[PDB]
Each structure stands twice: as structure tokens, then as C-alpha cells.
Design a binder for this molecule. Sequence first.
Ligand SMILES: CC[C@H](C)[C@H](N)C(=O)N[C@@H](CCCC[NH3+])C(=O)O
Ligand code: CA
Ligand code: CA
Ligand code: CA
Ligand code: CA
Ligand code: ZN
Length: 316
Amino acid sequence: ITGTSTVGVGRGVLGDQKNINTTYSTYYYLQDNTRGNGIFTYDAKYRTTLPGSLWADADNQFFASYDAPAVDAHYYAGVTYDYYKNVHNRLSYDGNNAAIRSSVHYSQGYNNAFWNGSQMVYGDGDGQTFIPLSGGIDVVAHELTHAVTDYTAGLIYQNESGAINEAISDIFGTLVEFYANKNPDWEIGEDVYTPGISGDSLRSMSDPAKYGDPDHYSKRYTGTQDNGGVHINSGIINKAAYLISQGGTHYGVSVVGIGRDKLGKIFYRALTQYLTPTSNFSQLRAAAVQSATDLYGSTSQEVASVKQAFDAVGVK
Ligand SMILES: CC[C@H](C)[C@H](N)C(=O)N[C@@H](CCCC[NH3+])C(=O)O
Ligand SMILES: [Ca+2]
Ligand SMILES: [Ca+2]
Ligand SMILES: [Ca+2]
Ligand SMILES: [Ca+2]
Ligand SMILES: [Zn+2]
């Protein structure tokens, strides 16, 4: 909508107060004009018609229970935009400041979130398995990273390319969570999963097997569920990324960690310059090796650690 840029205030899903960028034109809308061509947040009103209605509020205060998922979707899309721009010099998901659109209150009791090819979509959860999923910065950044991937490498969402697609989303979802630096970890979705259970998450990058996912190629899933295991086999790559950053010894193979910033630079370059729609795990190792060689040199510690990490998870 055409209007003037304003700053509202509200509370997110976990009860934290934050300022949001809004637009005033009769109502105050969740339209942030400060980032690219805009960040826009919509109400799906418990239905599945998308995007729904651009979020309108009479007073620019967003403290109602019903408001909280909107606040967080809007705010955390902004953080994710800021991460890509400030860390990687990328302007929105298409690199040309595309509008970022999200819908909240999707369906009833909907225990997921997704990128639909055009926008973000967040369920409210059923209140037992999940609370509204935009409450997780890593979840918001995971879903927006699918838009990045789709515009860049274009990894097909099945089998090994699909597991890479998912791992890239978990890696950058985690690096965004560290960038915002509130309560960061190497777990996925902990802030919105199972409010009745402390210390769990959907997936772990540090120890994928904690939630039943493989941490070595020899344990890969080869069945047909989950698009050939895209959220299962992602654990193999997630473990490699964890090892590259943090170091460790895994199945007797020691990796020297090089830290989060270098992990992000290596994987962002691989994603944007080397991976293709059909890349498999072997091709990801090659892309990461080439990326680290470009940035740091062939005889660098960074290259050595990339190789050691892929060796550790059985990917040649
Ligand atoms: C990043 C987390 C987000 C919910 C994502 N779409 C995801 O990982 N979903 C998988 C895990 C289950 C989510 C709720 N049932 C999934 O398999 O869809
Ligand atoms: Ca209000
Ligand atoms: Ca966390
Ligand atoms: Ca996390
Ligand atoms: Ca929990
Ligand atoms: Zn995903």
C-alpha cells in the first residue's frame, strides 16, 4: 500500500517486546519499507487461501495474542534480510531486493511452516507439538533460505540434492540465529517445538542421531518417504557443516574447526557459484573444496578442514 513509514510496537510468540516497521494509510499495516522492495506480512485467518489480507491494525500496537505470530514473522524476516545483506552482500532472496511476503495463521492446528515458491507460510501449531512457528528465528531463516536456494543453485527437492537443499536451510537458519545472537544453538526449531518438553528440537546439527537422523553416509536413508529422505539425510551434511565450524572427532576422524563466519562464506559461495539443480553429496564436497580454495588458497587450513569434515561423514 502507499503510505508513510512508521514504527509500531508489539510482543512476539515468546512474550518479548519488539519494534516493527509499519506503513500508515488509514490503518497501520505490516509493511516494512526500510528493506529492499518491502517486507509484507499477511493474515491467512485460519484458512488456506494465500496470501490472505495484508495485516492491518488500528493503533500500531501489536500486543494481542492473535498478533504475536505476525510480529515475529515480520521482525524475523527483517533480521534474515539484514543477515544476507550485511554478511553476504545479497539483497533479498533474488539478489535484487524482491519483496518478502509471509502469511501467518495458516489453516487450523497446522504443525509446519514452508516456502510455497512465492512466499512464507506459518502455521500456529496445535499447541502441543508446536506453538506458532514464526516464533523460531531459525525456522523463519530456514524457510527464507529455500527462496535463496531456489533462485541460485536450484537444488531439486528430492534424494541427495533435496537433502543438500534442506541442510543449506538448516545451516543458514542457524547462522542467522547466531547473527541475531539472542539464544543461539546448533539445534533446529527448539523455541517453537513441544512447549511441554524442555531441551528438545526437531533436528540437531551437532548430533543428528539424537533425533534419529544419519550422521554418516553409510547410514543414509534410501527409501521413498520424505521425498527420499530430504529431512533425514540432511543430517549427514549438517554434521559436516557443524564439524567445519566447531571441530571435533567423529568416527575417529578429527576436524579442526574454522568458525561460523568462514563456514558461512564457504557454503554461500558454493551455493551461489558451484552447486546445480542435480548436485549430489560428492558434488557438494567438490563445490565446498573449490569455494574454500577460492577464498583461502589450496594449501589452507580451511580447505583441509572442509576435506576432513566430509571424510568424517563418509562423503568422498
Ligand atoms: C525449519 C523447520 C520447519 C518446520 C521445516 N518446514 C521442517 O523442517 N519441516 C519438517 C519437520 C517437521 C515439521 C513439523 N511437522 C517436515 O518434515 O516438514
Ligand atoms: Ca493494535
Ligand atoms: Ca536457540
Ligand atoms: Ca536453533
Ligand atoms: Ca520443547
Ligand atoms: Zn525446509
